[PDB]
Design a protein around this ligand. Structure first.
Ligand SMILES: CCc1c(C(=O)NNC(=O)[C@@H](O)c2cc(F)cc(F)c2)ccc(O)c1C
Lengths: 20, 338
C-alpha cells in the first residue's frame, strides 16, 4: 500500500529545509 | 467587504513597525534556561523562564558565525524584521529580541502542545473535517501575510504548533520575505516545493498556495503527495504533472487539490483574478465559517494534554549543550540592524 511504502521510506521523520 | 478593511488597518500597523523595527528589548540574564526544545545547523530553540514575569518562552538562539557560513544573513534579518511587525491569531508571537557577542536571540511564545507533525504521524491521518479546520487557519494566515507583500515559503506540519485551544500557531519565518515582484531563492522543504521553484524560475506567492495543497493532502492522506527516498526523485514526481489520491478522499477534496497542485500558474487557485476567494468559496470549505475560525469560536478537533506551563512531553529530548558567549564581538556589521 502507499501508506506501507511511505512508512518504510527514509523520510517519515522531521524534514530539514534546503538552503542551496 | 470588512475582510478588505480589516486587512487595510492590519497593513497600517505592519508598515509602521516594518519601517521602525524594535531592537534590543531584553537581555540574556533576564531568562532562566530550562531545556533544549529543538536544534538546527545554525541554532537551537530553548524552553526558558522569564525572571520578571514567571512566563515561559521558546528562545531561539542563532550562532552569528554559523548564520554567516550558511549564507543566511539576509534571511535571518528578514525573519526578525517581519516577526516584530506582524500580528495575527495563527502566528507565534515574537516577545523580545536582542543579540550579544556570539548570538542572535528571538524570544517567542512557548506552545507546549508541540508540532502538528508529531500528532499527525502518531494518528496516521486526520479526518476531512479535522484537516479542514487546520487548513482554514492556513488560508486566513496566507491571506493576511500575502496582503502585506510577504511570502512565507516554509509550510509543513513541522512548522505548525498546536496551542492549548487546539488552534494552529505558525512558526519558522526563516524563509519569509517582503517582496512585491518575483523572487528566485531555492529554499523550502523538498516535499513542499512548487514546480517553478525546482525549475529555477522566478516565482511569487503562488508557491505558498501550492504548499497548502501539499499540506491538505498530507493531513488527509497521512503521507505527502510526492515522496521518495532522495530529494531528486521527489522533484521528478513534482514536475511530472501527475498526482494520485487515496480512494477515501471526497470528490470535493480531490477537486480542491487538483486546483492547488496545479503546475500551470494561470490556473492555480489563490493566483487567479478572484485570489484567495476561489479557495474560500470552494465546495470543500462550504461548511467553514471563516469569521468564527478567525475569532477562535469553532470547537477544535483535538486539545493537547496539558501537564503544566513549562512541561515538554510533546517534544523529543536533545543533548544539553553550552551557550557560549565570546569575549569578542562576532559579525557586528552583518547583524547591525538586528
Ligand atoms: C520547538 C518548537 C517551537 C518553535 C520552533 O522551534 N520554531 N522553529 C524555528 O524557529 C526553526 O526556524 C529553527 C529551529 C531550531 F531548533 C533552530 C533554528 F535555527 C531554527 C518556536 C516556538 C515555540 O513555542 C516552539 C514550541
Amino acid at each position: 500500500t502507499t501508506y506501507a511504502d511511505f512508512i518504510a521510506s527514509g523520510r517519515t521523520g522531521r524534514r530539514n529545509a534546503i538552503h542551496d | 467587504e470588512s475582510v478588505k478593511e480589516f486587512l487595510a488597518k492590519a497593513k497600517e500597523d505592519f508598515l509602521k513597525k516594518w519601517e521602525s523595527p524594535a531592537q534590543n528589548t531584553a537581555h540574556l540574564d533576564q531568562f532562566e534556561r530550562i531545556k533544549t526544545l529543538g536544534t538546527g545547523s545554525f541554532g537551537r530553540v530553548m524552553l526558558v523562564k522569564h525572571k520578571e514575569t514567571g512566563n515561559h518562552y521558546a528562545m531561539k538562539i542563532l550562532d552569528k558565525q554559523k548564520v554567516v557560513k550558511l549564507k543566511q544573513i539576509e534571511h535571518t534579518l528578514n525573519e526578525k524584521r517581519i516577526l516584530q511587525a506582524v500580528n495575527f491569531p495563527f502566528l507565534v508571537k515574537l516577545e523580545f529580541s536582542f543579540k550579544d557577542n556570539s548570538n542572535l536571540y528571538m524570544v517567542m511564545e512557548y506552545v507546549p502542545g508541540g508540532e502538528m507533525f508529531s500528532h499527525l504521524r502518531r494518528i496516521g491521518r486526520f479526518s476531512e473535517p479535522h484537516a479542514r479546520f487546520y487548513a482554514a487557519q492556513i488560508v486566513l494566515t496566507f491571506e493576511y501575510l500575502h496582503s502585506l507583500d510577504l511570502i512565507y515559503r516554509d509550510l509543513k506540519p513541522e512548522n505548525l504548533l498546536i496551542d492549548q485551544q487546539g488552534y494552529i500557531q505558525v512558526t519558522d519565518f526563516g524563509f519569509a520575505k517582503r517582496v512585491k515582484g518575483r523572487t528566485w531563492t531555492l529554499c523550502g522543504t523538498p516535499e513542499y516545493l512548487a514546480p517553478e521553484i525546482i525549475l529555477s524560475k522566478g516565482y511569487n506567492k503562488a508557491v505558498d498556495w501550492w504548499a497548502l495543497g501539499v499540506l491538505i493532502y498530507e493531513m488527509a492522506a497521512g503521507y505527502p503527495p510526492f515522496f521518495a527516498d532522495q530529494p531528486i526523485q521527489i522533484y521528478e514526481k513534482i514536475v511530472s504533472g501527475k498526482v494520485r489520491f487515496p480512494s477515501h478522499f471526497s470528490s470535493d477534496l480531490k477537486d480542491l487539490l487538483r486546483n492547488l497542485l496545479q503546475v500551470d500558474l494561470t490556473k492555480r487557485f489563490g493566483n487567479l483574478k478572484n485570489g484567495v476567494n476561489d479557495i474560500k468559496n470552494h465546495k470543500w470549505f462550504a461548511t467553514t465559517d471563516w469569521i468564527a475560525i478567525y475569532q477562535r469560536k469553532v470547537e477544535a478537533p483535538f486539545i493537547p494534554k496539558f501537564k503544566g506551563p513549562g512541561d515538554t512531553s510533546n517534544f523529543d529530548d536533545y543533548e544539553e549543550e553550552e551557550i557560549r558567549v565570546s569575549i569578542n564581538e562576532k559579525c557586528g556589521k552583518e547583524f547591525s540592524e538586528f
